[PDB]
A paper describes a structure:
Coxsackievirus A6 (CV-A6) has recently overtaken enterovirus A71 and CV-A16 as the primary causative agent of hand, foot, and mouth disease worldwide. To initiate infection, enterovirus particles progress through a set of distinct functional intermediates: the infectious native virion expands into a destabilised altered or A-particle, in which the internal capsid protein VP4 has been displaced. The genome is released through a capsid opening, leaving the empty capsid as the non-infectious end product. The major capsid proteins VP1, VP2, and VP3 are arranged with pseudo-T = 3 icosahedral symmetry with VP1 subunits forming pentamers around the fivefold axes and VP2 and VP3 forming heterohexamers around the threefold symmetry axes of the capsid.
Author numbering:
A (entry chain A), B (entry chain A): 9 to 300, 304
C (entry chain D), D (entry chain D): 15 to 69
E (entry chain C), F (entry chain C): 1 to 241
G (entry chain C): 1 to 49
H (entry chain C): 146 to 193
I (entry chain B), J (entry chain B): 7 to 256
The structure:
Amino acid sequence: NAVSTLADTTISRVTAANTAASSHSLGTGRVPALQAAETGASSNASDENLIETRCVMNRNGVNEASVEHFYSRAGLVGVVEVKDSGTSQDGYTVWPIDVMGFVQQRRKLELSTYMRFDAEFTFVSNLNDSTTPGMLLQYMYVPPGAPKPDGRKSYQWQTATNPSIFAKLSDPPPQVSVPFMSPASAYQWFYDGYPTFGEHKQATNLQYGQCPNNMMGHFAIRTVSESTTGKNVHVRVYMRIKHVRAWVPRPFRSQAYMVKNYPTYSQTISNTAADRASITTTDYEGGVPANPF
Amino acid sequence: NAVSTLADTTISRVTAANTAASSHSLGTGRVPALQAAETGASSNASDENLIETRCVMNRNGVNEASVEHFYSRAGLVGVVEVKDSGTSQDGYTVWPIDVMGFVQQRRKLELSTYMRFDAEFTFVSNLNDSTTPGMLLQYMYVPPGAPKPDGRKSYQWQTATNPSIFAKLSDPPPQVSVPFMSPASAYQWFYDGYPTFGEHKQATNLQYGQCPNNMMGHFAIRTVSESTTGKNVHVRVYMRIKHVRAWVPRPFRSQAYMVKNYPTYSQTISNTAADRASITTTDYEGGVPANPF
Amino acid sequence: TGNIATEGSTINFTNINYYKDSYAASASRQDFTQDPTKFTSPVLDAIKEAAAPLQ
Amino acid sequence: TGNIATEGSTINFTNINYYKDSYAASASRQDFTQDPTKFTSPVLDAIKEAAAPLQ
Amino acid sequence: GLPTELKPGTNQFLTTDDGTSPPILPGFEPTPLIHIPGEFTSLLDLCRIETILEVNNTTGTTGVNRLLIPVRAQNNVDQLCASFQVDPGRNGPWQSTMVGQICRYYTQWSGSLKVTFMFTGSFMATGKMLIAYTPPGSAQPTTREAAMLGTHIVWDFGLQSSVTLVIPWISNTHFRAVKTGGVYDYYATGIVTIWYQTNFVVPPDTPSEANIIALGAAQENFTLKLCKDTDEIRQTAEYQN
Amino acid sequence: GLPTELKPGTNQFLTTDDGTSPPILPGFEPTPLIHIPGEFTSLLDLCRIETILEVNNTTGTTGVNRLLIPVRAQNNVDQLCASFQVDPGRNGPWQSTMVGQICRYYTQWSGSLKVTFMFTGSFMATGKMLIAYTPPGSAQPTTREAAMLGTHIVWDFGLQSSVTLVIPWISNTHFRAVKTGGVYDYYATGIVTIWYQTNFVVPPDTPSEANIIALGAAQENFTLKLCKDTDEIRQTAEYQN
Amino acid sequence: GLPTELKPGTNQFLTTDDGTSPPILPGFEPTPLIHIPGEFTSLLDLCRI
Amino acid sequence: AAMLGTHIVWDFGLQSSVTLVIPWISNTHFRAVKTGGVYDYYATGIVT
Amino acid sequence: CGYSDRVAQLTVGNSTITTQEAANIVLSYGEWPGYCPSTDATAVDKPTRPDVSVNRFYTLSTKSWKTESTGWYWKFPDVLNDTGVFGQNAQFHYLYRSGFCMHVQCNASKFHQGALLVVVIPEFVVAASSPATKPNGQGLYPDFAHTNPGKEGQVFRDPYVLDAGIPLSQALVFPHQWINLRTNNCATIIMPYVNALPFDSALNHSNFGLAVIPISPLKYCNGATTEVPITLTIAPLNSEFSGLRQAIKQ
Amino acid sequence: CGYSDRVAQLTVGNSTITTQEAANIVLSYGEWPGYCPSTDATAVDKPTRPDVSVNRFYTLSTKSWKTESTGWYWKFPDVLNDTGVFGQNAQFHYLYRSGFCMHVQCNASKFHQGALLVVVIPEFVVAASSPATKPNGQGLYPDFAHTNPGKEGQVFRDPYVLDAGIPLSQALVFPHQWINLRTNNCATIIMPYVNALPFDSALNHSNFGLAVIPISPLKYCNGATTEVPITLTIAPLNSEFSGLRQAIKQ
Ligand SMILES: CCCCCCCCCCCCCCCCCC(=O)O
Ligand SMILES: CCCCCCCCCCCCCCCCCC(=O)O
Ligand SMILES: CCCCCCCCCCCCCC(=O)O
Ligand SMILES: CCCCCCCCCCCCCC(=O)O
């Protein structure tokens, strides 16, 4: 029944491609080595045709180079500072939900052009001294067009419909599942166009590349208090993508990022490969040659 | 079904070898006592052939002298001090993952030459006064070649892919399962060779005996803070080997260890056996002999 | 045939959804697919290994 | 036939893996093997107990 | 059921824990999924694409010039044209390939690699090149006679402009660590040197200097293991854009 | 299901608790296991190997000399050649054996032990030795007539250089404690003394002094119980290498 | 399963609670039980003396 | 140098004799009995 | 056969492209361009399919390849958004969808040499390089000329990073083909409609970028013809326009 | 039979070892040396098996046993890494695997006495003893001479701890055999390939250590021959080399 279903739930081992034994091929007409990169196709040549191979029954597992496994790992996507001391005694902050803020997660996600995933969001919250007192905090997801709070105690924190999460800093970090929320059929890290009609003749073309299909509202975070607590709270937001489909692979970014929502690079072009003295120089000592033949 | 499966899960009693009743053997030709240690084989002689035995149906259990049971016990493998006071106000530490640091665990594991096991790692963390306040800590496993953090707040703590564990000192100790992580088919506590080709003509032959098949990266541990907390944190790391296979048994170490990754002993050779006055001296008073025959 | 690195299967009470929304479920990583051709050999005329590609 | 040290078997809800990775499972200690010969009698000519070993 | 006891690991947050969390939006139905071309489900599919090796990663060379191995008519036979190590992790020509960049997201790798060399001289230019692969023991061969003793292909320029040197998986271990240098030179894969088998011969009124473009990839038996964060990108601190 | 109540033992960390912990690496497949010779699955297999007893553990004797029982042509019959107690736990000749070192990792032990004595005089040397085992009640026999009343073997030197004294399991209890001395002399196993049954006789131009090498092990009925940490190794403190 | 809520009586230690506790010694087999005369299983047997 | 050729290690014991079979390792099917000069072409070898 | 024929003929609408050095044709992601199915279709307006009128080869831009030329790119459908009946259908309608057949024609004698990588980059977001001096240089956002070059195309300033901060070396991940003057003289990339949405505005959004980059520079001996042109010819396939209104130009 | 015959003949390749006092042959871990199976094999290069050329008895080292001699050890395949065709195959190739047949020959008259323990220690990591005076004495790491003695072998300085901090008494756990001049005069240990990896570099890594230690010292009366040699003869079995390149010596 559903018992047999639980039995076959452990991730099974898919092995890599085996090698077959091969011998010498002294004939004309058959040329596996010769390819044509011009055609745009990768070489079809196997080890067995270029050299004499033995039979290897390869048992190495490939299950971990999956878009599921690659991306199903929580990474820092935002740090919200709930300032309630000195000049900033607001005791609330509204943080625009974007995942393009930190390199490690940004660069992974930008391997794809389009991605459709559910995410799991964890809120690791603490004070300046890494201490977690019994201090109550409200995390309210504000979808695009929901009114954003303008004060510590405003009507917007009633949350009749907005999903919110009450937790103490003292408690283990809050976590929630979020669905694939997007008008478009998949998210889209690169949008080559403008969201509005117009002629786009501005000394600063900000609008270029900004698709609102991705912009998924704000998280409003406050300390549920009556007055200034005199304490700042750091909220590290961790996103773990799941149920992930990805389309159209792209080159991994080489240049350091400069701004959040725009691919832009310093005019100093850092080379993709770390340079060396000459094209015939390798950094490997090796052993003492037996016949110096 | 899977119900019958749960029924037969309690560790069953395997008994030790029974003794059979034996009588006198006054014949030539049959000599169980006589052996030949020179052949390299242990004596094959049984109690029943050397003396007159009774029938004993031995019910003593042997299930606990297994490599599973012997090693499936958490032992101290590391103490990481997260210094954040006085001269050392880093508030982070990167600890090289090695299990050869403490005698009790080292000596057990070095009974084998090769071992393949999954391990379970527990982090007992506290302050100098053995107190556990609500202080948030990040334990990040940094596999070999993953960038190691160089500061309390560096980009390396985003953990897009590195597995990390957030816990408060206040919480019960963090625990995680770790797989058999090694390029080689088993781990190897003794490697009789050098990891690189060369001639090895250094006044200090450090490279000898160091196989990177064992070196399994670092754990980076920080207090998730903005500034010096002025408090040092001790992290006792406890490793419980499991799913354990072991090959090629070796002598238990006699000499005291001196360094972590090198079998080296003081020129003062401590004898394996505690010495006594003479070869015919035993420390046992016994009783008053009836006929002093 | 798991990642246990020794003989043993045990009992697998895992991959359970406790919520009426199915997107609340654990990462769907039961299935692995490897179709590389759409990127490595996207040409119309499939080229055999032996034959010289352009003639 | 357990280590209970008295008559009783009860019900055994144990050895359950709650994770998709099988290496997350509890110590595999259902099976005990005792093959000592590979270390105690590794010689080619097996020697009977009775017979004087070298002749 | 009701009698429970919490074990170690409670109230912890493991980032790579695959678990359930309560959903924030009851009854939410996501947008229908339409068919999009070019879905990929595996990163080993991405590793089997030929991408350009930056073999000319030298002090002077800049921009697209770093992707070209220069070749020319030689006065002297058996001079070394270029040379590069074939461990994807190592800082060097492999950094510019998709395979080299995906390897740096993993700790250990296995299986045959694949270098395709496309010559881009004039039609009238002819020549032969010995592309030898030396297994880990040895240094970079100083003469062509040293190199020919390793896995090599002699490549003749003709209508087919490309050739493929499959670098076979010759390792003691089932998996090499991506990290190299220091004690980790235990997993050094080897060196690939390109020698002139004969000279680069052109007729009059033809350029006597051309380029070879090396394209690195991985074979079907290629595998990765132990996802880790990459070295290859850096922002200043935890609080940046 | 939902209504639960935590019992004592929550939030505790028992080191010897066999439990599950969340895995740190989803979908990780370990290196394939190849066949390696000499797999052992039990430490009782390791106890049934003969290893040398340090019977000559005396003030003066040093290095390999501690592993040799000296023997010689005697002017006087029935002198005591050597003597050792046969409780593996006790500080003494058993410490040098694999069985003695594995016992110190357990609290209680049971079953027959096994001492093999190999003589290493010249071929021309002959002799007989009475190897007696005295059960726990008595002191070390002062004369051979006292010893002969216990489990003994008379051993004749010939082509077969070895003999085996099986020490039978004669205990009141099913298991003896490894710890001995004090009230724990309740579990004393006994003494094994070696007497000259006849003299060590050699012809002219032959060494008149030789050695016996004692090899201790355990029999098939040998069992251990209650894994504990050993006494046998010590570092200075909790913070050391 | 995963959604649980603790009821009163949590984190308490009732001395006469009959419960399970984690064992301190994996795979431990106790000494075999031999036959001993004069086993008693009830204290009403002791009252009828 | 010698151990690299066809050899027998001979232990003295009750059996007083041993046999070194010199195997027929020749380029030709037959060697000429006459040796010395150009006829050292058929030299059989040395036994040390 | 098991080999790609050198000689090839491409006939769409009332236009035919003949090439005698075709190094095979790339079909991007191994999928043919097709009309939007009923299931993927979201918009209820009946979509006009002009067929031959819009589905035909348009020869838009010819460029002179020089020894120091750094490369050119175009944005589809931006390149064709003002040319032929396609242009008019694209201005008169809101929603748009089609795949295309790229064909870059570059011949030179057997005594010239050089390699052009021709690559179709979906969602080619042109970056702007900011000078090291100022963190927010005015050239942090690329002006409309760079994002939408139109028919004339735009010269790469940094072709090494494909003017997008991604290495050109790894651009071979996208559907690509080389023009080695040694072997071939044309590059054909059939590309299906690739977008998260089934229909998009032709004017506002560019589905693909068409990039021709000289990897190996063009070299030749004194006496050969210095002028070596590179011509872009594009044929929309299975074009479908919807949401008819007043013609809007960009 | 149920008894080991005294007289025994060992013939591998073009070499034969005859012994009239063989105390049986030890087969380490009750497993015969065999070629790497397809399933365990990781490396795709076809492995050369030179057979008789490399698989034969090599008599490498003879040592003079004295009353105060403390013992000798060798490292396999280090001992043979420069001798015969094996040496050349081991230098010319990267990966290496073989088991071996050890045979230690030590005869003396029926009027000499002494015992040699001959033991094969897998992964024999030679330690360096540091003098009590300084905690980090320069002799904390053993120099290359001690770790890789080669053909000539190395004299034990502390044979009681087998120069590795492990008691010699418990060395009998490893495959071992005694040479009692009373009973026998040869010790034969057939050893299969024991390593975590299916193939390893012959030059960098030593699979096994061959240790001959005099437990009972050699003693004899005035008039007997003082010179009593101990000879090591090793025959590689099922040798398999792979990854051919330029010959490298250590
Ligand atoms: C109270 C907290 C509830 C959690 C709600 C989380 C909602 C998150 C929306 C989904 C995140 C993925 C889309 C990210 C796209 C932004 C990228 C960008 O355009 O810069
Ligand atoms: C965040 C914490 C996650 C836990 C990750 C643990 C990773 C441990 C690696 C496996 C440990 C066993 C190998 C030890 C070998 C080191 C011995 C040595 O060579 O000195
Ligand atoms: C709580 C009951 C859960 C039952 C889960 C299924 C267990 C089936 C028993 C066999 C173990 C699974 C793997 C196998 O089929 O070998
Ligand atoms: C939650 C239901 C778990 C069921 C576990 C199996 C129990 C079977 C009943 C018998 C007890 C096991 C030992 C036996 O077979 O005697």
